[PDB]
Design goal:
Radius of gyration of chain A: 14 Å
Helix content of chain A: under 10%
Strand content of chain A: over 45%
Modified residues (Phosphoserine) (chains B, D): 43
Distance between the termini of chain A: 10 Å
Shape of chain A: globular
CATH architecture of chain A: Sandwich
Oligomer: homotetramer
Glycosylation sites (chains B, D): 89
CATH topology of chain A: Immunoglobulin-like
Binding site for L-thyroxine (chains B, D): 6, 45, 108
CATH class of chain A: Mainly Beta
Function (chains B, D): Thyroid hormone-binding protein. Probably transports thyroxine from the bloodstream to the brain.
Protein name (chains B, D): Transthyretin
Number of helices of chain A: 1
């Protein structure tokens, strides 16, 4: 599908499993509208969030609940979550992979954008 | 100056200069209330954002305007901005440095918390 | 297979294609012995470097030629290459994914280690 | 002090203190010749490695002993060390800061080159 989220754990050197992910889209009136949500699988991947038809142009926010992830492992992390905000499909439909790498006091995120 | 922000540019291998940074504090009703802002210096640093007195425990958001930074350099960016959201704790160490490393399609952020 | 290398481009937000990768293993006498080599595909991935049987315990070096990659794009980068050195299989056979994210003056690397 | 090394810990959100760092210079025969070394300070920084005079153009390797760092903290690390290899150029800016961010199974390094 057009939107994919992949999460890794930099401490354990593994996928980050069962991580809650919520997607929002900015509405005409400037609010964050709930768009889709899910949790990562054993492979640290979250597929099937949306479809080519539904995933129109817009500003989207992908919020990854990293705090709940770390807390369940006994760690009190720095960040409340990891928020990735971007404009999508402004030059036509694209496939987006939002990758996140997590550490207790650090995270990085990368976008992989391909033309289908 | 208990809260500091330091920004690096991974493409040019230098500090990210003149980058807009907005800090917000989560209000009782869950909306984001403007708290402080500024532009990174020639050293990619932003000091004097707040004081020990105003910097009370709570949830804060640091928003770094990476999009405008990349636009000024003529490079297509992916993100609207980089947002760092965290809880300030009186117990933990005291001085917060929010460090960020920027690329057009990627960014990383780290807390460096000391005394 | 047991060894996989994945490379992404943080500037273009894409896989890094045609990147040369050389693998070495530390010998009994302490030298770097050529073990395997290859180049990343269109997906920025390099598979088939070795086999479960061949990939024994040892200290391995994965050298990614990031300089040639950047130079072919018109960029003179900081690093000569990206070298990832690690001990493998000391607690039994594992599957290793060596991921690298490249920028002209920066790179990060992460290991994803799974028990097959 | 034209070459500097600064190391951060992504797990504890602090400087990486007492980390061994070895610098090498590539010799004519392609072997790595010891050049300078030290341990990061309380600020995670290592200054005074070399001088403007000894720091001539050439290929240098900075080796950071991340394995020993993680072993001291009781955390299983993946890498033997972090190696940063680069060419020093007289034309480019002059002061080199090799920054590194460390996690047990991941590290990033960035050049911050200024005047």
């Amino acid at each position: 599908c057009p939107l994919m989220v992949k999460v890794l754990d930099a401490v354990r050197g593994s996928p980050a499993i069962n991580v809650a992910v919520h997607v929002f889209r900015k509405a005409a009136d400037d609010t964050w509208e709930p768009f889709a949500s899910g949790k990562t699988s054993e492979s640290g991947e979250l597929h099937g969030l949306t479809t080519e038809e539904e995933f129109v142009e817009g500003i989207y926010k992908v919020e990854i609940d990293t705090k709940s992830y770390w807390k369940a492992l006994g760690i009190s992390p720095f960040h409340e979550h990891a928020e990735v905000v971007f404009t999508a499909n402004d030059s036509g439909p694209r496939r987006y992979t939002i990758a996140a790498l997590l550490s207790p006091c650090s995270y990085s995120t990368t976008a992989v954008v391909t033309n289908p």
